[PDB]
């Protein structure tokens, strides 16, 4: 299920970065076809995934990026 | 490739004479953090409006001459402008906003933008998502972030930790976005740690030399950690 | 100043594998015919479908490669981009291309377009005042072509008078539009004629001498002949 | 009235232009507000002025261009 997938990052973020200045993720591929629902649903899983972090910052490249 | 993240921000929020918006100032702050005063980041505010009104165009031209100003002020090196739409064609304008920035220069690859601002209400998020979609179809990277209100500004030195988070797939790019935001003064005292984390299947070791070879390969210096997922 | 106009054009006609669109290549023919060579025109072509949608992206692609190829073919030295825009989002995504076209770079001080294909019947219409709008509100002048279906290509070599009707206010900018255009071989065989049309209280004798001096003053060979609008 | 001057033009670049290979005229200014009838007027009107001309390129400037 998302939520227990998202509670569960939840936790781990928080125990091993509760205390941290500035947290970077993945951010996840958005929904498709703009059903309201299942954008409701996109944004509540990234807030309840990082619930009470307070400086987060969501990256998602073209996966055509070469950094080296 | 050498890749560095050529900055597009897209802002949506009101406008007044009267106040000046923190998030706004602190988006343009983290901007100026990744950018070091390189770079040339393009700037975009969308102005609900007349698009053939005098009176809104002079609008317009007073935010953008806001944008300049508070640019110069964090340093950040660019342009900025301003859009003007009707209420019913914000979304048309912000998708060809971005399909035409960098006409004949320089493209930006990556958009910078905050998380919406007020709780899901049964619009703010509607445009968010066409933002994420606008920026994947013109082959730009997305940075999103998120608590921008606590976001520093060039006054403070950080200090502690910026925990980059790694998953099965993924990329070097967020592992990149920390190591420039640990160049600038602002965060020059944080120590960079990245965390993978593993799978039922994956062994905590071998995931944990992997990472380091590669933190390794991108000549950036962090700290390593695996945590296991499940539980 | 030496203001020479640096183009803009918006194409807004369907596209198809199956066909080329004479309008449209005449219009890139114009355009090239005033440029001689020089300077650097943007083509801008905008396309309905789904601008979040990676087959209309792919359609937009090859749109622009034919442009890109079109353009080459007239000599029109300049870029060419394609705008994928909702039905219902073509007034924010004409009107925001106007305003964001430039950013960084030189900006366009000309728009070109052409006249209405179809007889008004109770759209095509409501895209065209749009444009002249944003235009003027964006600071540029714009120039229309009527007629474009029988305009000349490279080919041709046109003899005859090019004429310019002159009125008590306007500008030089209609005889400067003819003497470049004159510059070009395709219109080079032409005399050029400046037509100044009198009112009941202009004397003819004195509006004569006037555009003779101006025309003097902008280094443009021409004929004056003033004709009475009166009768 | 409109159509009058309209037609009068018309007449007039005719008489003296009738043959020749292109005319340049003043666009005049567009109507305001979007009224569906103007804007049917403002088309109409230059339509009766070029009645029969085959080339026709009609220019409107900011007034600010500065030529020399």
Redesign the interface.
């Known amino acids: 299920s998302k939520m227990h997938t998202a509670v569960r990052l939840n936790e781990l973020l928080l125990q091993h970065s509760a205390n941290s200045q500035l947290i970077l993720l993945n951010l996840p591929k958005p929904p498709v076809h703009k059903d309201q629902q299942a954008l409701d649903d996109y944004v509540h899983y990234l807030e309840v995934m990082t619930d009470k972090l307070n400086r987060v910052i969501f990256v998602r490249g073209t996966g055509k990026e070469v950094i080296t | 490739?050498?890749?560095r993240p050529q900055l597009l921000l897209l802002l949506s929020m009101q406008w007044s004479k009267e106040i000046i918006d923190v998030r706004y100032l602190n988006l343009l702050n983290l901007a100026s953090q990744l950018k070091a005063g390189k770079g040339?980041t393009?700037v975009?505010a969308f102005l609900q409006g007349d698009?053939?009104?005098?009176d809104d165009?002079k609008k317009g031209e007073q935010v953008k001459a806001r944008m300049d100003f508070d640019m110069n002020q964090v340093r950040l090196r660019?342009?900025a402008?301003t859009?003007?739409?009707?209420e019913?064609?914000?979304?048309?304008?912000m998708?060809?906003?971005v399909?035409?920035?960098?006409?004949?220069?320089?493209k930006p690859?990556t958009m910078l933008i905050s998380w919406?601002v007020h709780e899901?209400e049964?619009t703010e998020?509607?445009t968010?998502?066409?933002k994420?979609?606008?920026?994947?179809?013109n082959?730009?990277?997305?940075?999103?972030?998120?608590?921008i209100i606590?976001?520093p500004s060039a006054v403070f030195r950080?200090?502690?930790?910026?925990?980059?988070?790694w998953?099965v797939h993924?990329?070097?790019?967020?592992?990149?976005?920390?190591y420039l935001?640990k160049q600038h003064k602002v965060?020059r005292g944080?120590k960079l740690?990245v965390?993978g984390?593993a799978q039922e299947s994956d062994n905590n070791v071998k995931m944990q030399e992997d990472l380091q070879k590669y933190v390794y390969?991108?000549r950036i210096d962090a700290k390593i950690?695996i945590?296991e997922?499940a539980?």
């Open positions: 490739s050498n890749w040339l393009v975009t698009p053939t009104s005098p165009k660019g342009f402008k859009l003007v739409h009707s019913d064609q914000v979304r048309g304008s998708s060809t906003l399909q035409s920035v960098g006409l004949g220069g320089l690859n919406p899901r049964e998020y509607n968010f998502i066409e994420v979609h606008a920026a994947s179809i082959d730009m990277a997305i940075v999103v972030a998120k608590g606590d976001f950080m200090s502690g930790m910026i925990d980059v988070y998953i993924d990329g070097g790019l967020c592992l990149l976005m920390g935001l965060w944080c740690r965390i984390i390969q991108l950690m945590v997922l539980d």
